[PDB]
Amino acid sequence: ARIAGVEIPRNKRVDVALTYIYGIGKARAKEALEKTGINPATRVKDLTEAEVVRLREYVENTWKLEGELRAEVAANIKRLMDIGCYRGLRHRRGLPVRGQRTRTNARTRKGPRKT
Amino acid sequence: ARRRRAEVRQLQPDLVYGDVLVTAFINKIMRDGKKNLAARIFYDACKIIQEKTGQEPLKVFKQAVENVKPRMEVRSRRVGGANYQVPMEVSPRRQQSLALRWLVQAANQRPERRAAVRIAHELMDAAEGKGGAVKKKEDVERMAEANRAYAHYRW
Amino acid sequence: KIRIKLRGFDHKTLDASAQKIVEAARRSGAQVSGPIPLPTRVRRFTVIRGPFKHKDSREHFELRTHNRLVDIINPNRKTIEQLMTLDLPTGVEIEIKTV
């Protein structure tokens, strides 16, 4: 339900609904769901409130989530810049850093076709 | 092919009906090399045509493939630098093979979710004579009768 | 007791010389283990036909290291005297080891 405040997952099958949060996936979701022991088979509309609050207090206080992870990646790219590194330089050009080839395919972050 | 008549090929018979008219039907729905999916989706259809109506899946399949195979078909012939389309009696070797080819394309256009209910309903639609494949056959048979006047450019 | 191994390439004269060693051991009387043939080890090399810029059109060579094994369980005194001076190497390496 209303787990991480503003970000709200609900609507038919809580197990895949928690995957829909930035920071929680299928592996960590199966981790939290196996720890809380709730069977994933039921939906979110048939659930007890205490299980939702314990889900909240578990995933909200155990790992790094939405606010801190987004701010952390922001500080990460700010750390890549202002040091004169190839990674920060490459992020400043707005081009991929994982050794791809720009003679033919880097359009995802290069943007539209600029003929 | 130039001189040899492209030698005929008989398939191995079916394992549940012992016939061969169902073998090529399994083989065309066999996509990218999956006979385990092909024969199972064909046998699923044979199971569906038990509850949709109380008929045998062999006798309903014969009716599904008898109407869809055409009698005539037009071909473009060059007689003196001009292409005239003439209709002719389509060979029985091509009749069933083009018939099942029409059946699979008629079933893949159906808006149903599963392919089993897509192929099963279109089979009885072909047996009744209202399916898309017999519709495609009806386009050709009316095109041939429209080109009926080509009765002196035959071969 | 004694393992006699023949290491060669050509199974033709290799099998022939091995069969003749078996025949000479049968000439010596007592039984001897049959010629159990070990499998051949293949060392393949893919080279190019042209001497430049041709990624396709490869040719492939091979190295066939054939091995034959005979084991003597009846070391008769002149059998071992005969098998040390009657060694005729036809390009085959011989290994006579005791255990």
Binding site: - | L15, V16, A39, Y43 | -
Partner: protein
């Protein structure tokens, strides 16, 4: 008393020993309907006996190496033909039109 047959197709060598009995069949020490669980062409190897109507007149010991599933069963029926031409070789004039002793290349 004992009839041996060999069947080879698609790298699956079938070594078949059929003995006179009730019709029981065993594959590599284990049995037919459990080693051929949920498949659809298990009767394809039994077809050469159905053709001569030898339903329950032959027991068989089966040892096959190599391949997958279908090369094994086709090699089985090839061995049944190779051995049913051994015992009572009159089955050639009724075997050749249906096509059993045919190693598919």
């Amino acid at each position: 008393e004992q009839y041996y047959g060999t069947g080879r197709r698609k790298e699956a060598v079938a070594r078949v020993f059929l003995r006179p009995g009730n019709g029981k069949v065993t594959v590599n020490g284990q049995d037919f309907n459990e080693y051929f669980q949920g498949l659809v062409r298990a009767v394809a190897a039994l077809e050469p006996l159905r053709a001569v109507d030898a339903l329950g007149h032959f027991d068989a010991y089966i040892t096959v190496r190599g391949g997958g599933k279908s090369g094994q069963i086709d090699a089985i029926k090839l061995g049944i033909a190779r051995a049913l031409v051994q015992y009572n070789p009159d089955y050639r004039a009724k075997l050749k039109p249906l096509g059993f002793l045919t190693r598919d290349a």
